[PDB]
């Protein structure tokens, strides 16, 4: 004996642009809340530690959003002029920010009242202030003064090192993982300058030409650095010092770029790149940086970020707009005497000699139409086919199964105009689609052969056939057109 086969849902040949496993994961960023801010949100960053609250810089203020609540929990408004960054330290205890005045303020994250260290980096605005990932103490600062001073938290009065050489605004600083000595900066000159802090410094080790003003530089991996500038982003390798790839799908100038690796997605690593065209799209580094998904937003996107790898909860996708609109998308993640009377159920037989299991696994409950085919209820299985809110694919099967079983006339004997109308109404709709066109062609012929006389005396059915006769005719015209195109193509090739 053998268990009964489960009826096999029909699957017509794959059509173009099928849903890919990458897209299925990223479509789960469903819940969308739009918040409005006074000015353009310039920079967004995530706390590396639990609960991974993320900071957003807008106008003269920095706001920290709880991960679970998705609402402001701390506000830093002490800054007099605009603020330009909110990067966390690796530990996540501190928060550093810059000003147009040029001062760099280090606050204790989650204690906005206390200011730990204040540094007068330069008289010009201080756009980028990043902590060093490997080393906690050293803080980097970039100014429109075109010098990227390397600060130390212990000694604030003088810089530990003062990298220079850029002939334009520096707005991008990156630290290469596993090479703490190395520092990577990008200017609007179109050159990405790499420096070594172990050496004397103040002169770049070598420059990589990007050919357009560089808007952000991100070190994707210890040997690869991806830089987004102008209308494209190019990934560079330092060992060879040449570009492995470049992608120009974007239209407006890319502005921000972020990277995340080793999260529960099918795609191991993701590169999200803002567009300034309202787009923020995902690229896959394991696949030569090919696109896999994208979102569109109302205005240009000036900052992007995704929750870190160790999110430990609902994931977040955050984007920033020049209109001040902030868009968040989230992937949500008896009595004792009785118990003593029955205490054996927990046991799984770890100490026993012989373990014997015979329980058959529970199968998914079978739908009504399958129950009727299995019990040989041919006519009812047809009725269940046409019921309100029945998925189209499932209905097409129970027509096919009956035809495959050889029960087409048998399912249509005891029927009149009252109970034949549902079949024709589906057929009126099924005839359009390519997949069900052959099957509807088959059933429609039978009911005519079997209800010719009934059709004459029933006026309602007569209309159903005129309307059907109209649409089948319309289908002929479409198919005839397709042939002419097909012939047209063969001429070209």
């Amino acid at each position: 004996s053998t268990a009964r086969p489960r009826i096999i849902t029909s699957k017509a040949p794959l059509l173009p642009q099928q849903t890919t496993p990458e897209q299925r994961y990223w479509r789960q960023y469903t819940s969308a809340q739009l918040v409005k801010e006074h000015n353009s949100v310039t920079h967004i960053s995530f706390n590396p530690q639990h609960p991974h609250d993320f900071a957003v810089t807008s106008s003269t203020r920095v706001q920290i959003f709880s991960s679970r609540t998705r609402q402001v929990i701390k506000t830093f408004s002490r800054f007099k002029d605009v603020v330009y960054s909110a990067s966390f330290r690796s530990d996540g205890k501190l928060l550093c920010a810059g000003d147009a005045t040029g001062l760099v303020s280090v606050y204790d994250s989650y204690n906005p009242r206390t200011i730990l260290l204040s540094i007068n980096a330069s008289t010009h605005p201080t756009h980028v202030t990043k902590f060093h990932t490997q080393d906690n103490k050293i803080l980097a600062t970039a100014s429109d003064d075109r010098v990227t001073r390397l600060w130390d938290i212990s000694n604030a009065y003088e810089p530990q090192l003062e990298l220079t050489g850029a002939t334009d605004y520096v707005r991008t600083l990156s630290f290469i993982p596993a090479a703490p000595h190395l520092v990577a900066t990008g200017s609007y000159d179109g050159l990405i300058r790499l420096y070594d802090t172990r050496s004397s410094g103040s002169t770049p080790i070598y420059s990589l030409n990007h050919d357009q003003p560089v808007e952000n530089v991100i070190a994707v991996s210890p040997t690869q650095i991806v830089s987004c500038g102008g209308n494209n982003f190019k990934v560079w390798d330092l060992t060879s010092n040449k570009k492995l790839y470049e992608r120009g799908n974007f239209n407006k100038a890319v502005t921000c770029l972020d990277y995340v690796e080793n999260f529960d997605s099918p795609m191991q690593s993701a590169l999200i790149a803002s567009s300034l065209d309202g787009h923020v799209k995902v690229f896959d580094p394991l696949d030569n940086f090919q696109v896999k998904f994208g979102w569109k937003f109302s205005g240009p996107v000036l900052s992007c970020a995704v929750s870190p790898s160790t999110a430990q909860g609902n994931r977040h996708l955050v984007a920033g707009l020049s209109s001040g609109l902030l868009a968040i998308r989230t992937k949500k993640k008896k009595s004792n005497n009785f118990q003593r009377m029955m205490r054996g159920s927990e046991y799984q037989g770890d100490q026993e000699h012989i373990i014997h299991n015979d329980k058959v696994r529970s199968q998914r409950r079978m739908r009504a139409f399958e129950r009727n085919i299995n019990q040989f209820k041919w006519s009812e299985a047809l009725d269940n086919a046409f019921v309100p809110g029945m998925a189209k694919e499932l209905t097409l099967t129970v027509l096919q199964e009956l035809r495959k079983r050889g029960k087409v006339r048998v399912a249509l004997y005891g029927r009149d105009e009252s109970t034949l109308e549902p079949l024709l109404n589906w057929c009126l709709k099924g005839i359009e689609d390519v997949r069900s066109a052959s099957i509807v062609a088959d059933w429609v012929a039978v009911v005519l052969e079997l209800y010719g006389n009934t059709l004459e005396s029933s006026p309602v059915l007569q209309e159903l056939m005129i309307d059907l006769k109209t649409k089948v005719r319309h289908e002929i015209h479409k198919s005839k057109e397709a042939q002419r195109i097909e012939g047209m193509l063969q001429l070209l090739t």
Binding site: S1, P5, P13, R405, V408
Partner: protein, 471 residues
């Protein structure tokens, strides 16, 4: 199976058995075991019995027994279908039995088409033997001489219900071809699904192709991809040839039609499925089911014989080489290259050996007296086989008659060294040899219509111990 309780006229059931129950019995002092005989009427060519012994306690197969289950192209000897309420394809009515028996004897005696050859395959990794039974594949171990598995490779009403009366006229999908890649991990199947009768779509056969895969430890093949109507609509896939080891590391195959098309499929890791890598246009309206296909060990060139003409197609261009066109006296049956040098081409009248290097036929042997029209096109493919090291074999079977033909047959194997210069061996068996193919070691296996797989190849203590054992 129905157990009728006669006290209350109730019943208990054991359904979905492998075949119709010819016989039942209760075998034991306390009715411990039920013994059943099953028929598997699907195979109309032969009577494929299977003996079951079920434990009465839980109605589960205590012992299942069956011989090899090939499917021959036509009925053999005196096989007669069982008795049904109606005359159908799979059964005989009350009256039709005697008349069908007479027609069967007259067909075996008078007619001239006597092709009972059956397709079979040999698994490289395991050397199990794969039988393409109707709508299923039966995996049989001939070293141990037992069946190991029986898997349904098609859709259709296979075991969902027991066909009765008119339903019995339905034809389940038929596995026409089944082949393995050289590496032995991929299984290719080609199937024809027959539409029901008396409908509009009752003349458009559906050609399906499927790719399966399994690990060595596992025993069930898993379907990995499915192509519906390859090469177009209603156009058969006459031939399947798995690729040699060189190209894609044995992860590809060629399929050939009756219209002259070649489709080269390969396994793409990025996609993780098989995909149609190369194509040739089957456009010219010359139709013939007689097509031969061979592939050189290197994988560079392909030999495609269609009707009476052989073509040499480069693999890189998938087009004629830039002599590639060879005409034969008649339509080609089999094209095989015994070694990289020599190509052995069989036509309906003769067989020949040709040097690709010289392009000159060396030896030609006349087959017409033995093979004239007894075999349909493409079954000589399965009668002839070629080793990869030593040489090839030709199998020729003939009817024995004394004073009009008689049902009994006699078979003869002929071992040919490469290029057919010498006969290494000559042998004769006393029954129709259906298939002979090359197992991958030196020996060859062949199948007889008796379903017999033959092989052609190169002190007081001592008493106390006895008394203790007796007790």
């Amino acid at each position: 199976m129905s157990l009728w309780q006669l006290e209350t006229n109730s019943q208990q059931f054991l359904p979905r058995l492998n075949g119709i129950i010819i016989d039942c019995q209760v075998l034991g002092p306390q009715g411990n075991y039920y013994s059943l005989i099953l028929q598997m009427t699907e195979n109309n060519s032969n009577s494929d019995y299977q003996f079951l012994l079920l434990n009465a306690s839980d109605l589960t197969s205590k012992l299942s027994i069956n011989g090899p289950l090939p499917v021959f192209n036509s009925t053999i000897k005196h096989i007669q279908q069982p008795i049904s309420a109606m005359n159908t394809k799979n059964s005989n009515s009350i009256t039709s039995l005697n008349h069908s028996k007479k027609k069967q004897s007259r067909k075996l005696i008078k007619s001239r088409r006597q092709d009972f050859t059956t397709n079979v395959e040999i698994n490289p990794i395991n050397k199990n033997l794969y039988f393409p039974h109707i709508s299923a594949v039966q995996i049989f171990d001939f070293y141990k001489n037992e069946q190991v598995n029986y898997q349904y490779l098609t859709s259709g009403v296979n075991n969902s219900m027991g066909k009765v009366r008119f339903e019995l006229n339905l034809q389940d999908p038929i596995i026409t071809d089944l082949k393995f890649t050289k590496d032995g991990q991929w299984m290719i199947t080609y199937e024809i699904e027959y539409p029901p009768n008396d409908l509009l779509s009752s003349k458009d056969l559906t050609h399906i192709l499927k790719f399966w895969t399994k690990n060595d430890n596992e025993t069930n093949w898993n379907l990995k991809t499915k192509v519906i109507n390859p090469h177009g609509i209603s156009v058969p896939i006459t031939k399947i040839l798995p690729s040699p080891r060189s190209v894609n590391n044995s992860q590809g195959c060629l399929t050939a039609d009756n219209n002259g098309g070649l489709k080269f499929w390969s396994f793409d890791s990025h996609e993780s499925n098989w995909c149609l890598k190369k194509i040739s246009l089957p456009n010219f309206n010359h139709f013939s089911n007689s097509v031969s296909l061979a592939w050189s060990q290197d994988g560079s060139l392909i030999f495609h014989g269609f009707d009476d003409k052989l073509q040499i197609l480069d693999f890189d261009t998938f087009k004629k080489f830039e002599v590639s066109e060879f005409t034969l006296d008649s339509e080609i049956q089999t094209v095989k290259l015994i070694n990289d040098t020599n190509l052995i081409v069989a036509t309906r009248t003769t067989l020949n050996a040709i040097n690709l290097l010289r392009g000159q036929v060396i030896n030609s042997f006349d087959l017409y007296p033995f093979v004239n029209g007894v075999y349909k096109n493409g079954h000589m493919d399965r009668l002839i086989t070629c080793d990869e090291r030593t040489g090839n074999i030709a199998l020729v079977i003939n009817q024995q008659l004394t004073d009009v033909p008689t049902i009994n047959y006699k078979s003869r194997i002929i071992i040919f060294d490469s290029d057919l210069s010498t006969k290494l061996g000559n042998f004769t068996h006393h029954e129709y040899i259906s298939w002979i193919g090359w197992n991958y070691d030196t020996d060859f296996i062949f199948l007889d219509i008796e379903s017999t797989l033959g092989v052609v190849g190169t002190s007081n203590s001592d008493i106390f111990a006895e008394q203790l054992h007796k007790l």
